[PDB]
Curated annotation (Swiss-Prot):
Belongs to the shikimate kinase family. This is Shikimate kinase. It comes from Mycobacterium tuberculosis (strain CDC 1551 / Oshkosh). Mg(2+) binds at residue 15. Its cofactor is Mg(2+). Consists of three domains: the CORE domain which forms the binding site for nucleotides, the LID domain which closes over the active site upon ATP or shikimate binding, and the substrate-binding domain which functions to recognize and bind shikimate. The lineage of its organism: Bacteria, Bacillati, Actinomycetota, Actinomycetes, Mycobacteriales. Pathway: Metabolic intermediate biosynthesis; chorismate biosynthesis; chorismate from D-erythrose 4-phosphate and phosphoenolpyruvate: step 5/7. It is found in: Cytoplasm.
Amino acid sequence: APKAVLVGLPGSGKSTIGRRLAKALGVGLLDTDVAIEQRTGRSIADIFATDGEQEFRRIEEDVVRAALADHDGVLSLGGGAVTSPGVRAALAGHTVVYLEISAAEGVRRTGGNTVRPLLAGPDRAEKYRALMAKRAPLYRRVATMRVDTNRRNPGAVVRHILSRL
Ligand SMILES: Nc1ncnc2c1ncn2[C@@H]1O[C@H](COP(=O)(O)OP(=O)(O)O)[C@@H](O)[C@H]1O
Ligand SMILES: O=C(O)C1=C[C@@H](O)[C@H](O)[C@H](O)C1
Ligand SMILES: [Cl-]
């Protein structure tokens, strides 16, 4: 089982806090987004564009289930993995760290638009707040630890988690 599974909105720090937390624990980071682009050989954008979200979500879920069983390090989920109920089910019993971020900050953290199909285009503030409205209940539902990352720097978020594992 992972030492911890990080979830939260795009730009909440999953990948960054993931890396740093893995380094601190001396374990591997598995980043499901990364695991998908390797498993498929495609970008996340290319999948969303050629295959659609439903098809991404299915590939994501399979990867997520395997990671949850096979990885003993830090597992960072794609930002919308929690929208799959099979994902949410496979999370039950795990150490799930919900990185919380305000919309204004999240908007700004994602502002060099990392790809992110679902944040792409203009009206990014609006889209980000709508992602938050829909997913926040889902993150809270799967979370065993909620960490506010709003005015905490990545090292402090890492320490807050480490101290609570
Ligand atoms: N606690 C934090 N404080 C400041 N910037 C952060 C923090 N967490 C992440 N970031 C920055 O925000 C950007 C998005 O982080 P990332 O780890 O890619 O988020 P996610 O994996 O959740 O999309 C990165 O440049 C990272 O450097
Ligand atoms: O639905 C989402 O919020 C996301 C999906 C993909 O772009 C990536 O899996 C990412 O981490 C965000
Ligand atoms: Cl994300």
